[PDB]
Amino acid sequence: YEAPPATLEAIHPKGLRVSVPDEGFSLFAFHGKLNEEMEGLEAGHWSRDITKPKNGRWIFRDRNAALKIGDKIYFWTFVIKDGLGYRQDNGEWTVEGFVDEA
Structure with a gap:
């Protein structure tokens, strides 16, 4: 195992x-x-x-991500728990969740 699955949503075409x-x-x-x-x-x-979670989980938001249901993502992430060090691979995630930057 190497870090849990990231929940990449699908915000408006402005993030x-x-x-x-x-x-x-x-x-x-x-x-x-x-x-x-x-x-x-x-x-x-x-x-x-x-460098710190929010609401119990590590949430993030951008403002230059213009995508919509149907797109895809491919990258990786780095983490550090109990001074162990983890990171996700495979780089592959299909957009299947909408959201509002409000």
Whole structure:
């Protein structure tokens, strides 16, 4: 196992939302793109690091993600729980959830 599945929603064409279930992490890193996959684990388009959860889980929101039900995502994420260190791979997520940046 390497970090839980990320719940990437589908916000309006003016951003996006991506949250994940916290099981004891202390640091989170978000670096992915849209309708485009990267190689050699590099910094795609998005770049940020969550140094603290919110509401019990690590929630994130962008303002440059213009996608809609039907799109896809391919990237990875870095985490740090109990000083172990985890990260998701495969880079593949289909949009199947809408949301509002309100």
